[PDB]
Design a protein around this ligand. Sequence first.
Ligand SMILES: CC(C)C[C@H](CC(=O)NO)C(=O)N[C@H](C(=O)N[C@@H](C)C(=O)NCCN)C(C)(C)C
Ligand SMILES: [Ca+2]
Ligand SMILES: [Zn+2]
Length: 253
Amino acid sequence: PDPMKNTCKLLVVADHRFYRYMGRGEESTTTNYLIELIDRVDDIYRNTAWDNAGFKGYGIQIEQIRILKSPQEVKPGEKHYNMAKSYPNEEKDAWDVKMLLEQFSFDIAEEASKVCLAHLFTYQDFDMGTLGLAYGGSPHGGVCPKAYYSPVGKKNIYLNSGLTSTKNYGKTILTKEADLVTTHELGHNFGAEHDPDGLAECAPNEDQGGKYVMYPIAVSGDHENNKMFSQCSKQSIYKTIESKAQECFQERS
Ligand SMILES: CC(C)C[C@H](CC(=O)NO)C(=O)N[C@H](C(=O)N[C@@H](C)C(=O)NCCN)C(C)(C)C
Ligand SMILES: [Ca+2]
Ligand SMILES: [Zn+2]
């Protein structure tokens, strides 16, 4: 590993919903929550041996936190990931999650071009139990900005993005659950796909430590494997990492 290129620096964005409902309308409470979360996720990454040997020490650090204290005012017909209303249905608590990720990536494009990853932290109840979403590791995008020309947006956006909501089914999720969401989405960013039932090594039973973090169904977090990457994830990311590290990773602060 290259100690000058072992860290994926993040632009972390807290939208007005997160500021209000997790941050208590305070900058300090908002930034402390995120700093602590990313540091705990970093512990997972940094300790992961991508080959099962000496290939560990890769992780994540926050470069900047943008704190949006109030909604983005918009004109009729215009949308923005930080606007007051949900889209496409203003009557729902939350956006359609795929549309929200696309919109965030559009709005943050200038900033996203200058960082390894951008991640949106929000507080809205996505339909049917969804907690987050990311580009990369889908059967493209992920670490290091990769351009996509949006025919609808009429400009390049970058696919180095993901999001986490800390609201689900009308309440704030546990911190131990929040850590898992952000680890999972960053896992896609690093190149992992979902762990399949058909590979027992990558999706163990409850009495063998339970599921690993890239399982498609939320790992509740009290089982041994829940906060670890499966061997499937490791192999996938291992192809990602060194290449991408040279491309956009920096020295750990
Ligand atoms: C951290 C989790 C694993 C993220 C995934 C979504 C995902 O794959 N993002 O990259 C999720 O929200 N999964 C949901 C999930 O497991 N939600 C749990 C909390 C849930 O609703 N459990 C009860 C069944 N409705 C789904 C969509 C499967 C319902
Ligand atoms: Ca939800
Ligand atoms: Zn996923």
